Design a protein around this ligand. Structure first.
Ligand SMILES: COc1ccc(C(=O)C(O)(O)C(F)(F)F)cc1
Ligand SMILES: [Zn+2]
Length: 257
């Protein structure tokens, strides 16, 4: 099926998913001098105090930390958003090398990885209905650079051994996603899509200006994961990122000057 390899990667997706060539595809390059400061954007409201993590899953192209989204426990509000978006999961995209890995780029700069905290619009009842709507998802994107370790990431790092291959999951309770945030919530925002198939154009992207730092040791443990299932030939889970797509008729807005 689809993947990130030579023969099934981003340049092939349009054959099964024609929206790959659509008008609001993600990710994009964030040109910081062309993005417009909008003083009518509110501050982001990240309310994760009551978040309930449940499990961590290797789904064959990332690892997802999944949350209980049956109540308003961990919600995103404010910023460019109308209404309330519930946290369902977060995951990362990363490279085979420190100089690549992020999906979004900032003046063509690639970060070593990118964190996606995925939220769905409560007005649509559940995630599956939300992805069918132009304003169904809000994804908080956070760049990772390599330097100092991120203490709040280490618990994630230490469980990756137990979900090395596709389809493996592990209990993963009492994880606080607030430990993955930078100090500043300054952000860029633009309307976009899922960055993996089905590539639905359902996402309000909110990309934080300030990266978090992770250690070389932490990112190396991401790269020990496998795209394949157990007992299948070992293909390291690396470079699970889609390149920047054409901006077309879209304007990136900044919450800061
Ligand atoms: C079906 O479940 C997912 C579908 C698509 C995605 C993505 O394409 C994404 O990782 O870009 C994001 F969620 F950030 F939009 C993630 C989960
Ligand atoms: Zn993602």
């Amino acid at each position: 099926h689809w993947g990130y390899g030579k023969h099934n990667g981003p340049e092939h997706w349009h054959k099964d998913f024609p929206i790959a060539k659509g008008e609001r595809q993600s990710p994009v390059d964030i040109d910081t001098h062309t993005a417009k400061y909008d003083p009518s954007l509110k501050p982001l409201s990240v309310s994760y105090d009551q978040a309930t993590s449940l499990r961590i899953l290797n789904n064959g192209h990332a690892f997802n930390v999944e949350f209980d989204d049956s109540q308003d426990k961990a919600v995103l509000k404010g910023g460019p958003l109308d209404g309330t978006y519930r946290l369902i999961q977060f995951h990362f995209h990363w490279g085979s090398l420190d100089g690549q890995g992020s999906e979004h780029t900032v003046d063509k700069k690639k970060y070593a990885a990118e964190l996606h905290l995925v939220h769905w619009n409560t007005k649509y009842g559940d995630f599956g209905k939300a992805v069918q709507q132009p304003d169904g998802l809000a994804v908080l994107g956070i760049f990772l650079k390599v330097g100092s370790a991120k203490p709040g990431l280490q618990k994630v790092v230490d469980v990756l051994d137990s979900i090395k291959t596709k389809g493996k999951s592990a209990d993963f309770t009492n994880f606080d996603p607030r430990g993955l945030l930078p100090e500043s919530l300054d952000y860029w925002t633009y309307p976009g899509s899922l960055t993996t198939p089905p590539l639905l154009e359902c996402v309000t992207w909110i990309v934080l200006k300030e990266p978090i730092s992770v250690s070389s040791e932490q990112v190396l443990k991401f790269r020990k994961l496998n795209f394949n299932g157990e007992g299948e030939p070992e293909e390291l889970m690396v470079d699970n990122w889609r390149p920047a797509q054409p901006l077309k008729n879209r304007q990136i807005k900044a919450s800061f000057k």
